[PDB]
A = this chain, B = another copy of it.
Amino acid sequence: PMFIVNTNVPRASVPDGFLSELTQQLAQATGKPPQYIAVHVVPDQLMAFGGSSEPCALCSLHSIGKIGGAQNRSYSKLLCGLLAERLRISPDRVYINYYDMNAANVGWNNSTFA
C-alpha cells in the first residue's frame, strides 16, 4: 500500500518516528506485510481547508484490495487519530482519498503485480 499525507504543519512538528508508526499501523490495519507499505509525508505546504489556513491534511491511500465501505471508515478513524495526536490536526480538517488499485495498474520491480 501507499499512503501520502500533505499538510501545512511545519517540518519540525512531524515526530521523528512518524513514518515508522504509519508503516506499522497501516500494516496492521490493512493486513498487508510492513515490507510492502510505502509512506510519504509532505509538510510546510501552502493549503487551505474551507478557506482557513489552520492545520489541515490532504491524504490518499492506494491499495490492491482491502478497500471498501467498512474498511475505509476504520482507516479514517486510525489515520485521523494519528494526525490529531502526532500532528495536532483536527479530524474535520482532514480529507483522505481511497483507491482500490487493480494489480495490473501497480508497477513494482520492473513489472506489475498482475
Interface, chain A (partner B; CB < 8 A): 2, 4, 6, 11, 14, 19-20, 23-24, 34-43, 45-51, 53, 56, 58-59, 62, 67-69, 72-73, 75-77, 79-81, 91-92, 94-101, 104-112, 114
In the bound complex, what is the Cα–Cα distance between A69 and B111 (angstroms)? 10
A101 touches B106 (CB 8 A): no
Copies of chain A in the complex? 3
Residues of B within 8 A of A114 (CB): 69, 72-73
Q: A19-B46, A38-B48, A51-B35 in contact; A94/B81 too (CB < 8 A)?
A: no
Chain B residue at minimal CB-CB distance from A68: B104
Q: Is the interface of A mostly helix, strand, loop or mixed?
A: mixed
B36 touches A50 (CB 8 A): yes
New A-B contacts (4) at CB < 8 Å, excluding given A2-B97, A96-B107, A98-B105: A6-B40, A39-B47, A76-B108, A91-B108
Residues of B within 8 A of A38 (CB): 47-50, 56, 58, 95
B14 touches A34 (CB 8 A): no
